[PDB]
Symmetry: D2
Subunit: 219 residues, 4 copies
Amino acid sequence: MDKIKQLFANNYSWAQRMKEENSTYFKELADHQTPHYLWIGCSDSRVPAEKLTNLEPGELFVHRNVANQVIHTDFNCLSVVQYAVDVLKIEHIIICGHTNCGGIHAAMADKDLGLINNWLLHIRDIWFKHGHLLGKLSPEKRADMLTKINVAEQVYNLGRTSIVKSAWERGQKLSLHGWVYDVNDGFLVDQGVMATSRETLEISYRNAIARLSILDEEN
Amino acid sequence: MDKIKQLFANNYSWAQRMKEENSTYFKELADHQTPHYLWIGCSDSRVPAEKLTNLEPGELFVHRNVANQVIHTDFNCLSVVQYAVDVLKIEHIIICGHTNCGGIHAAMADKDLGLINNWLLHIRDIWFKHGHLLGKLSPEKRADMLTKINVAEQVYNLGRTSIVKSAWERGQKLSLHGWVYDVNDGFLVDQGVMATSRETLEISYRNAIARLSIL
Amino acid sequence: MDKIKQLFANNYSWAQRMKEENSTYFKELADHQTPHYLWIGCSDSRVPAEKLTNLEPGELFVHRNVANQVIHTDFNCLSVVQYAVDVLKIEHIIICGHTNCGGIHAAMADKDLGLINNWLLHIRDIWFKHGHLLGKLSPEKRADMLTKINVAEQVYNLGRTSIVKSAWERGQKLSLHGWVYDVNDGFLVDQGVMATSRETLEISYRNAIARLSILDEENI
Amino acid sequence: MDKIKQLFANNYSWAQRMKEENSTYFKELADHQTPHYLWIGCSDSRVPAEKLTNLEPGELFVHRNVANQVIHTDFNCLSVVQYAVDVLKIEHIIICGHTNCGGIHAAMADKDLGLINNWLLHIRDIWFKHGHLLGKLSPEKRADMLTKINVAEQVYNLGRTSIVKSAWERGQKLSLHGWVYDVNDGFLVDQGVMATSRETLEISYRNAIARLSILDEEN
Ligand SMILES: [Zn+2]
Ligand SMILES: [Zn+2]
Ligand SMILES: [Zn+2]
Ligand SMILES: [Zn+2]
């Protein structure tokens, strides 16, 4: 269409600009054949992982689903994880949520959107699991809180997969991370759950939930 | 692993530069609340979609899995599609493959990599479906061709989903595209399958396979 | 292997011992072509459902998975449910668990069994959801308790699917049930959740959970 | 609906004429703590597997889905398979289809039935793969030919899982079976694909398809 044509046009301009600029981008990219980080983010993709981290092209192995989830039985995401860990031997997996997430808003919404609702039912279970902390919070602020709690809960799901547990068990070096960034400042903020073993997973997980449960008198 | 640290050092340096330097990047980003294109790419993510298309930040709804697949029964991908079509009202779903795809290479290698092998079995089925064509090539050239055929097949699976078919049924405007770019120059290349209805899906899909089978 | 040769023998025997009688089992089946109940049970399949309900053959539509679960995002079971509801128009969906369940035991066990642990992590999430309650119970009981709670939580999951909500919402006749029979008794024990609409689902689930939270003598 | 009562009734009686009868059953059934067979059948479930095999109560580990499928990426069925193999040590996995199958008919009809159609696309793919054969066949015969072909294709899929390949690889005993019974007579019939290793799967699978490709006068 109009938009598709425009897109091919931008692509051509860019691609050839590189051609002329004798740009070494693609060659650089070719130097970093194997990625070192598995980035699991949201399909909203407000601020690209490349921009947030300014890493060298090819360093990131990416997976994106609605609301950056790691569901216990999702073959898709688990496939990406097992491949990044057992094959590419990646040592850092990073789950990253973001504020003003459509996935979060849709989950909290009472409208029944169809197939996607089922996928969002996992976020709702997370919402109620922390219903007290959240309810004890002002509406306008809950979204950002569920978004932050979501990340901690997903890092916790990743760390419990048979895949990740076996990696640690057999002495492989692997650390899980969980961050969130505000779509307005672009700053990555650690949510607290950071594991390098099942032990650190449990502790950092309890610790993060405990920290998030300590509310200021601003609600 | 000073990596994570160095990683946060990069983010701070970047977001800091933006603030003090007064960058309306987040201001503009905030303008485009609803995306207009669903991009289904590969987890290898060699050349970011944002770059390949040089689009305005926020315009793309993105899904990435190993080898840019649209498996008939994948709840993950189908959910992204249903939400994007039925909820965000996106009108263009773009499946994009890429040369030198590790996913495609793993599907071809005969080694048990574990869980991921089951995910790649779908690729191996596509390989057999086009075995006559692919059998004429060397392992090397076979990989480049399977990459292109894979994209065509995925577009074909996407257009066969009940989600996309019902969108066309009630008259919603929706087009499917399947492309591939070489990791060496970044030029996006149409593979031939472009649909706006079920009938056009069948026609272009057949024509595309017919065209791809000529050496 | 004799097991397969033997097994095939039984079949021939059964089948022939039917053909000679000019029996009508293969007729009293082609009449009940369309089922009226969707049975969702465990892969353990201790006491068969065709025997627990003594229903005429062909009346059940069945799906079995480890520990009878209805996971929000499981395409397999949601497909069975959707096809049951929207295409077969069946009106009753039963989620029947059973006592002394490997699934439940495996979920509670600390051992890492491989792939299946991931599927069981849903049971373990349920387990912690009711951590306090279950904690108070007596070990030899905890297992059987979770079995019961699990079924409750499964009906609630089923009731929360878009497939069932849209059914009700469009005025289609459909009820959800959740029981737990015992391998010894064989008596189907209703658990409390019996949604017929989303309002029901909420109340019954709410109560069923309240009822199970009231511990008796035995359980410490 | 009194159907639940009328049904709940049959249970109190049947289960009664076992207590007030000291009928072993629950006594014996309990003796078979572990099953030796994994049965993968269609949710239709015309003739139960308990009456088809006439095995001993509790011997079967069962999984049923629409049209008895083993989809490469189905977490549900792969979990049942893996558990039965790596944990229950079952050495026999049987896939059983049946004539006049709803899943097969629905898969062959153009009618978009909703979510289920996505599940059945895997069958339509099998249909296209054997399009020439099935085409040469006769209309009122296609359904049954695809039903047999389907069982063959599923055993193949099952033999190709990493779970099974690995079981074989480490020297575990395991055979795959693919049969189909006619709802009109309950006669179990081997479709030809029987495997005890990756090598027998291949030959057995190729032979079985070759045989089915042979069409008798009555299309
Ligand atoms: Zn988001
Ligand atoms: Zn790739
Ligand atoms: Zn069980
Ligand atoms: Zn069937």
